[PDB]
Structures are given as structure tokens and as C-alpha cells.
Amino acid sequence: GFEAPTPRQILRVTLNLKYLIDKVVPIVYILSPKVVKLAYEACGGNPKDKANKRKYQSVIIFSLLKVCEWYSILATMEVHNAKLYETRNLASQQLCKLLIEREETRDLQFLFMQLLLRRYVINENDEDQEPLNALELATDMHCTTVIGSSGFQRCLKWIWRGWIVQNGLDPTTFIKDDSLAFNPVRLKAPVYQNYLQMIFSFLFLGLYTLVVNGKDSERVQSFDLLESIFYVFNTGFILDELTKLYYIGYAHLSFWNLFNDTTYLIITFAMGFRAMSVTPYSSEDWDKISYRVLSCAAPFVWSRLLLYLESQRFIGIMLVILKHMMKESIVFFFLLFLIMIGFTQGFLGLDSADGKRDITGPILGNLTITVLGLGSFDVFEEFAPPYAAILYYGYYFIVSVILLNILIALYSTAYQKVIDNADDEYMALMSQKTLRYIRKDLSYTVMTIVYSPFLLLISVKETREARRIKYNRMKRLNDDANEYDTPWDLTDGYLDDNRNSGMRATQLKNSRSLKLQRTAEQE
Amino acid sequence: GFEAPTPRQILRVTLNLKYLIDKVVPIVYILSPKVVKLAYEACGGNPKDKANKRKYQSVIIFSLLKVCEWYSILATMEVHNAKLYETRNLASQQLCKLLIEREETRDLQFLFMQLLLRRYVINENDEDQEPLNALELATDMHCTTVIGSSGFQRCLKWIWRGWIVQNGLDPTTFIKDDSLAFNPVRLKAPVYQNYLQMIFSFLFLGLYTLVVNGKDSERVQSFDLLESIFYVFNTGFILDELTKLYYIGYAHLSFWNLFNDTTYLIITFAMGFRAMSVTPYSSEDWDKISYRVLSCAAPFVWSRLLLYLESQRFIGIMLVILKHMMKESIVFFFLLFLIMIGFTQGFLGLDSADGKRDITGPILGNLTITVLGLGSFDVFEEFAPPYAAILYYGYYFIVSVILLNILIALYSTAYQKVIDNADDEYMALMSQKTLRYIRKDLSYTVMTIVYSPFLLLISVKETREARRIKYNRMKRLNDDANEYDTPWDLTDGYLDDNRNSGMRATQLKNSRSLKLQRTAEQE
Ligand SMILES: CCCCCCCCCCCCCCCC(=O)O[C@H](COC(=O)CCC)COP(=O)(O)O[C@@H]1[C@H](O)[C@@H](OP(=O)(O)O)[C@@H](O)[C@H](O)[C@@H]1O
Ligand SMILES: CCCCCCCCCCCCCCCC(=O)O[C@H](COC(=O)CCC)COP(=O)(O)O[C@@H]1[C@H](O)[C@@H](OP(=O)(O)O)[C@@H](O)[C@H](O)[C@@H]1O
Ligand SMILES: [Ca+2]
Numbered sequence A, B: 001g002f003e004a005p006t007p008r009q010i011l012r013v014t015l016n017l018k019y020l021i022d023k024v025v026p027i028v029y030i031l032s033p034k035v036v037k038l039a040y041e042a043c044g045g046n047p048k049d050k051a052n053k054r055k056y057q058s059v060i061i062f063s064l065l066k067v068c069e070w071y072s073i074l075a076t077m078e079v080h081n082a083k084l085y086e087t088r089n090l091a092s093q094q095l096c097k098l099l100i101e102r103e104e105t106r107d108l109q110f111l112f113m114q115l116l117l118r119r120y121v122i123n124e125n126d127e128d129q130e131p132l133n134a135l136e137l138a139t140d141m142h143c144t145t146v147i148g149s150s151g152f153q154r155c156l157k158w159i160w161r162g163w164i165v166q167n168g169l170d171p172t173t174f175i176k177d178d179s180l181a182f183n184p185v186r187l188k189a190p191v192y193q194n195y196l197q198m199i200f201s202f203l204f205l206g207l208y209t210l211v212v213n214g215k216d217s218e219r220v221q222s223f224d225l226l227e228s229i230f231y232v233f234n235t236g237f238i239l240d241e242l243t244k245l246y247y248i249g250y251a252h253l254s255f256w257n258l259f260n261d262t263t264y265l266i267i268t269f270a271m272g273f274r275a276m277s278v279t280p281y282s283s284e285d286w287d288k289i290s291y292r293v294l295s296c297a298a299p300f301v302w303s304r305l306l307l308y309l310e311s312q313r314f315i316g317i318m319l320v321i322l323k324h325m326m327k328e329s330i331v332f333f334f335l336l337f338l339i340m341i342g343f344t345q346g347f348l349g350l351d352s353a354d355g356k357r358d359i360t361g362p363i364l365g366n367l368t369i370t371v372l373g374l375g376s377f378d379v380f381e382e383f384a385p386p387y388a389a390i391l392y393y394g395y396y397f398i399v400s401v402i403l404l405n406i407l408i409a410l411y412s413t414a415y416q417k418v419i420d421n422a423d424d425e426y427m428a429l430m431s432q433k434t435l436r437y438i439r440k441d442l443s444y445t446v447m448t449i450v451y452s453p454f455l456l457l458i459s460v461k462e463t464r465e466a467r468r469i470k471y472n473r474m475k476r477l478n479d480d481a482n483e484y485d486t487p488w489d490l491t492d493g494y495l496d497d498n499r500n501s502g503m504r505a506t507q508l509k510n511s512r513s514l515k516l517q518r519t520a521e522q523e
């Protein structure tokens, strides 16, 4: 395939596949090879021809994932009949997985470029939709049976390593690149963008902890080189995030984006106070309030690391678990806010009842404290003779006995649901990250000085990848075939390219000699 | 069907279906189309005739749900053989679901008016039973396989929107009404009764929080217009609830009814104290005690909102979860009351043992406090040399270590059981609400002033519904067929009626043109 069909043709392919799934899966419950042949025939084109059949069979995965999207819409609309459409959606996902795994054997470049990565357009209504591809489509709706395909994961691995890159000419194509052969655009790969963001997060943390522990004298400090590099890095981060915020408006509202914005916003306020102190009110007062508000950013700077270590399996599985647990705890937090607003209005009315509001601050404080179990009735002892005790102990009962134990229940159920699906949801997280990666002088000097051995290791590993790809292309293999040097295959791996062939010849000679050492040891 | 059979005939139809389910489902384990034909034949009537077959096939759903009722009674009586009758009850529910979904395709008005909504009478014993219909019957016994039918949910949607209304001539009929066409009786619909109760609950809350935060001076306040509107609304609510309490006696004992009665009772006491202060003992003392007891009603006024937002899915799912969790925690609360009564009798006997009861109040206080974890042994330090310590620490062990952790266990199990069945139990809750909705000058001025834009939005949405129903009746559709404008159907929705037909003609012209742009893109 080289030219894309029109959106109404892709709409017809989607309707033929939806009709096919409605006929083959009409019940809660299959995917025979005749059904797979029907799915291949549901697109259209002359069976006498080829590259006209492939032109419409290129949109097969995109159309099956839009069928999954439509069945999710159907389950949203017919809430009572959600199980039938969830069954149909799952059947579509399994058929899609079968198609991806079949075309992985048939032709790999056609699977990657045309089926999975090409951003097709579809006319769902009279409106024309944005160009999405099957990878982004399967990740947005969390098609875990599709994301856990061998071809899907291979495509994500090739994109991750930078082996497939977005075409600058057309942003819907994703041509391969030649890594067989110190290019700078190689550092634009998702592996190296991820690794450099990880190194820069650890470097940001190291510059942070060398600043907040910098205050030794009560006077204004020297404003060292590391403090300047630190505020330069943070003002770079806040201008990057505010350019993305102005450009991408109200879709930059991810939790991690707001978390980083809170981190950089706090450090910018600290920077401003420090700058005002350096060029002055009281200079030591501004320096003190600067280091205090900067020290408020230390949980954010140490919790930033989990975002930039999501590629590591331990941290990513942990954050998948935490995302599901907070998503379950939304119930507790709504009930806690409602009960807290109710009893807060009660106590503030008891405060206003005598005539003047005098202990409003201790009320807000102590009631907020009650969720931690640290609440004391000493504050309300001189308040109202039966009313404060009744309200406070009813509130403490509803929070500590009822709602916190409900929170433990929600967390237990959320963890039991997510620990079974931890690998699948982590694969969806890494897929989301991989597809996210395909959409002054002092700082540069510091970056060059600090990133040098990492660039060295990246370059030597890239040369090892290039020699591996050269070996895999010397044979008729798919550029990632010899990476592990496994025991069950006597002809695999890469020694460093004739030393590897000599090692394989040694392997087959020793194996064939020692098998034929006794003629009865056969079959 | 136009005339209802007698209760002994409906009893015979119920017995024939019970016999049929006993023959087809004799084991723990089916519902073949011959069984569905047998169920149609189990009612009776001449197969040569029609409207005499339909006269007795009208009670098929009511009779299958009484069969479900009888199998629930059987499982209550034969506790050992409860699994067989639960199987039979489930089989009856599935057969009933099949019948509802079949008659939804066959004839919709006959499904709604005659099968589901007509309140038939049955002679279970020599006594004659009340007129119940299949909707109310399936909700009282929680027939979730029947409530989650497409026809059941459609019938509930039509009742909810006011499209089917109870006949004033006969209260067992439920004739349709004509919405095709600013009627006041349109506001009597369950959608608008629900929405106006929601708006009035938020308005009650807004008037409440503008009163308890009204006290600024220690003297008696001005008795503003909002305070008078607030006490008028609350005395209207308490007279409404007491008329319902006198009329419906000891079946008005729902939790939410008692909760609202507690809210309105507290506000009435506050109203009485405020009224006595205004027309006087000490006036500022009565004003103070009025605002204190009114501020005691703030958790009730803020927790009232969950009742009037049950139609919203988030709040309704949350309250379904909370109902199941409290139903599980009944064990903990019984054991807690028993252990508390035991150790309370122990400490009060230790108080009486020296000769006089002097610290009884601190005993009741501290032991009640122990469940919150705030208990201190300082109160009992000067009490008895080994006895108070042994009793108090045994009590604190049984409450904090044993029983509160048991409460966490009960909550975990209750949430794990209800989160799987959250949609089904919420559908049963909304079904219960929908069937609940089919069983002075200053206040009117305030209501007219405050409900005006909501009445405006209701009227413009009603006109949109009327034009939609006019379009769906111009075709041979079922008055709710074009509501979503879906992508998989090229002929659906309502544009605002020739603009919609022009849009559909544009859709078919563009689709047929772009499909036939290449003749090979076919089939
Ligand atoms: C008062 C003093 C207290 C100070 C604070 C103390 C520190 C608190 C530590 C909090 C850490 C919690 C980690 C949980 C993260 C997670 O469990 O997930 C989040 C849910 O947690 C929540 O709500 C938590 C609500 C409270 C939701 O994550 P997300 O929706 O924002 O999606 C990302 C996006 O898509 C991309 O981020 P970026 O690349 O950077 O742009 C992806 O790279 C990334 O992989 C994610 O997918
Ligand atoms: C000391 C200071 C403390 C002050 C108080 C603090 C606030 C406490 C907040 C409590 C809110 C708890 C919400 C749970 C509601 C629920 O989870 O459910 C309840 C079980 O909770 C319970 O036992 C809780 C026992 C403690 C049972 O609900 P229900 O039996 O009463 O049935 C309704 C009927 O049928 C109709 O009410 P109305 O239309 O208004 O007439 C239907 O509309 C409605 O949908 C329901 O079905
Ligand atoms: Ca006060």
C-alpha cells in the first residue's frame, strides 16, 4: 500500500466489519479462519489484483479499532445491553490481534508502516475526523488484547528504539530510517529522550538538594554557580510548560503536568524571592522566605522521579497500581469533602451563634486534622455545652470509624483488581509513553559537561545495534532477531561478522559430533 | 388486550408456569424456543382466536414474576434446598427477560401497557392480593435479570419522561399521553419532579447557609426575607412528611424519610426558639440556642443532597455502595453495642461498688470515645486499683484490635460484592425511584422567582422532544428512535422536518458517490 483510501471508504470498511462482528458474534458467548478471510474480504478490492487488495486491507486494523470504539459508544448508550457490546468489542480486539499476528509472519514492514502506524482519516459523521493510527487508537480506548499483541509490541519496540520515525513530508506515514551505518537526530529517539529526561530529572534533584542545603549563614548567600544552573533549568522548565499550556490548552491538564507545574511554580516563586533579596523590606528576610518556600518544593522534587522512571518496570507497575487505587478512592474523597463541608458549616454556625466568630481558624484546623486521627476535643471544650460534643463526636465517628475503613475497603478492592491486570495496564502505560514521544550558554555548557559519559555509552551501544542490524540483514531476518543468544537455539545471537559464524559453526560441529558419538542416541 | 382476567385465572397461569419451570429446570444446572412457545401456551385461550390469546398472554410477565416470588418463598422455607429454587427463580427471570425482549420487537405498546404496567390482581390464597404490576413486582423482589431487560428499561424510560402516565379513570391501566403537540401536568413527569426536587434541595441548602451565617450581632437579628422563606419551606416539608406519616403509617420508615424528618424536626425546633425570641427567659439566650440547634442541622442539610442526586450515576452508584456496606456492618454494630453494654454495666457497677455513683458521665463518655481511638485511661486512674485497668484494657482490646478490624473486613467484602453488581443495583435503584413517582403566597412568589430559567429550559427541551416525536411518528418508529445521531447509522438523529431528510440525503449521496469512486471497492 502506498496511497490511502478516502474517509467514506474507510467508513464502509468499518461498517462491513461491524456487520461481520454482529453476524459472527450475536450473543454474550468463534473467530474461525473463514471469519478471518471474511474480514480480509470486508475491505474490498479486486482479488485478481494485488496492491489494490492491500490498499484497502491496509485499513483493516484501524477499522476494527473504530469498531471497538463504536461498541464502547454502544455500551455507553445501551447501559442495560453493555455486556453484549463488551463481548463484541472483545471479539473485535481478538480478531484484530489475530490479524496483527498473522501479518507479522506475512510481511513486517507492511504491518508496521501501513496497518499500525499510518494515520488514516475516517468520516464518522458528515464531519471529518482527525488522522489517528491504530496504535494511538488502541491506546486511547485501552485495547489491551490489541496492545498485548506480538506485532503491536514489536512496533512499539521499533518506535521506542527510533527504528521507525515520523516522516517530515507527511505526518501520517512513519517511514523507517537507516541505522545500519554520532548523529544528533538519533538522540531524538524515544529511548534516548526517555533516558535523557531521566538523567535530567536526577540532575534537577541533585542541583535542588545542593541548594536547599546550601544555607549556612543567616546573611544572604554567595549565589553560587550551581544555584544559577538550578534556576536556569527551572525557568527553562516553566517556560517549556507554559508554551505547551498556551499552545495545547486544557488538554495539558494531566496530573503529572500539573504536578510538574506545581514544582516549577514553587521553585520560580523561590527564585523570585531569592533574586529580590540579592538586589533589594529586608534582605535576610527575603532570603529566609525564599529558602522556606523552596524547601516546600522538596516532596515535589523527590516525587518527580516516579514519572521519569516509568520505563522501569518496578516503578511503572507501582504507578499503575497507585492510579487505580486513587481512582477507586474518589468515592471516599467525595464523601469526606461532603461530610467535612457539612460539619464545618455546623461548627461555623455554632461559632456565629454566640454572636462573634472568634475560633474559626481552630475549627478549620481541628476538623481537617480529624482525618489523620490527631483531632482533640480540647479546642471545642469551651464552645457549646452539648452541641460541639455531639457534632464533633458524630463527625469523628463518620470519619474515623465509617469513612476511613471504607477507604481501606476501596483500596483493597482496587489493588485486587489491578494486581491481576498489572502487566496489561503497564503495557498500556508504556504504549502511551511511546506514542507520546511521536506526538542559554551556561545551560548548554552544563549539559555538555554533565551528559558526556551517557552520550558515550549511547554511541557505543548504537554501534553495537548497527553491527547487530548488519548481521540480521546479511541473513533474511527482521533486524531484531539475534538479541538474546538463547540456549534452545544453537544458531542465534551476535558475537560482537565472521567470528559469530565461526562460533555457530563450532556449536553445530560440537553438537553434531557429540550426538553421533553414540548412534543409538537418535530421534 | 383490553380486559383483565380474574385472579383465579391468573393463579392458574402462574401455576402452569411454575409447573413448566419445574419440568424444564429440575436441577441446579435450557430455555429453548419450544419452552418459550410452551410459556405462551401456558396461559390459555383459543389459538384460532387473537385478542383472546393476548388477553391471557398479557399476564405472562406478572405470572412469571409471581413464580419468582414463590421460588423466593420456597428458598426461604427449604433453606437446605435454596440453590434449586434460586436456580428456578433465575431461570424464570431469564425466560421473563426473553419474553420482554421478544415482545419489544413484536409490539411495543402491548409490552408497555399490558404486560409490564397493568396492575393485575391474583388470588394467592383465598384472600385477594393488591393490584401490582410487573415493574413494581420485579423491583420489590429485585429481579435484576428482568430489570436489566431492554423492554423493562425502555418502559422505565417512557414512564420517567412522562410519556406513559397513570390513568385517572382506572389506577391499573397506564395509558400513553400525547406529547407531539406549556402544560403544568407535563411538570408532573418523573424527570421534572426529580429535577425540581433537586433544585429545591439545592435551594433549601442555599437558604440554610444564608441563615446560619446570618448572625453578626449578639442581639436578636432582623428576621430577614430569606429566613422567613427558609422557615416557610421547612414547615411545608415537615407538614408534608407528617401528612404522609399519618396517612402511610409505619411504611414511611425508610432511612431517607427518617433522615429528612430529623433534618426538618431540628430546623422546626430552631424555628420555634427563634420565633419565641422574636416575640418573648432572655431574647438573646433564645436566639443563641436557636442558632446553635439550627447549626446542629448542617450535616443533615448537606447530606440531604445525595438523596436528591441519586438520578446522577456517580452519586447513585456511591449510595448503592454505601447501602451495601452498612448492611454488612450490622454485624459490627451489634457486637459493638453488646460489648459496650457489657463493659458499661461493668464500669457502672465499679462506680456503685464504692457506694455512690459519682463519675458515671465520664464513664459513658470515655467508653463511647474508645471506638474513635481517642480513649484515655486518665479518667479511670483514680477508680479501682486492678479492676478498672483490666476492664478498660480488655474493652479497648476487643474494640480497637478485634472489632474495628472486623469492621474493615466486613467493609472490604461488602465493597467487593457490590462493585461487581454496581450497575445492576443502581438500575434497581433508579427503577425503584421511577416507580415511586407513579405511587403560602410568599412561597409561591419565591418559587416562581427562583424556578423561572429551569422552567424555560424544560419548555424548550419539551418542544425539542415534541419535534423529535413528530419526526419519529412521520416514519414508522417508536417515538425514541432518533436521539443520538450515531456514526454507524447513516440515517439517524434529528437535525432540529425536511432539513433532516436533506442531511440524510446528503449523507447517502456522499457515501454512495465515494464508495463507487472505485468500482473495485465493493462487497
Ligand atoms: C502538602 C505537601 C504535599 C506535596 C506533594 C507530595 C508528593 C505527592 C506524590 C504524588 C505522586 C502520586 C503518583 C501517582 C501517579 C499516577 O498514578 O498516575 C496519575 C494518577 O494519580 C493521581 O491522580 C494522584 C492524585 C493525588 C495520573 O497520571 P496522568 O493522568 O497524569 O498521565 C501521565 C501523562 O499521560 C504523561 O505524563 P508526562 O509525560 O510527564 O507529560 C505520561 O508520561 C505518564 O506516563 C502518565 O500517563
Ligand atoms: C451526630 C451528627 C451526625 C449527623 C448526620 C451526619 C450525616 C450522615 C449522612 C448519612 C448518609 C448515608 C447515606 C446512605 C444512604 C443509603 O445508602 O441507603 C440507605 C441505607 O443507609 C443507611 O442505612 C445508613 C445508616 C446510618 C437506605 O435507603 P432507603 O432504605 O431509605 O430507601 C430510599 C427510599 O426508597 C426513597 O427515599 P425518598 O424518595 O426520599 O422518600 C428513594 O428515593 C431512595 O432512592 C432510597 O431507595
Ligand atoms: Ca464565638
Ligand SMILES: [Ca+2]
Pocket (backbone or CB within 6 Å): A485, A486, A487, A488, A489, A490, A491, A492, A493
Ligand atoms: Ca545459542
Ligand SMILES: [Ca+2]
Pocket (backbone or CB within 6 Å): B350, B351, B352, B354, B355, B356, B357, B358, B359
Ligand atoms: Ca464512685
Ligand SMILES: [Ca+2]
Pocket (backbone or CB within 6 Å): A125, B485, B486, B487, B488, B489, B490, B491, B492, B493
Ligand atoms: Ca449518522
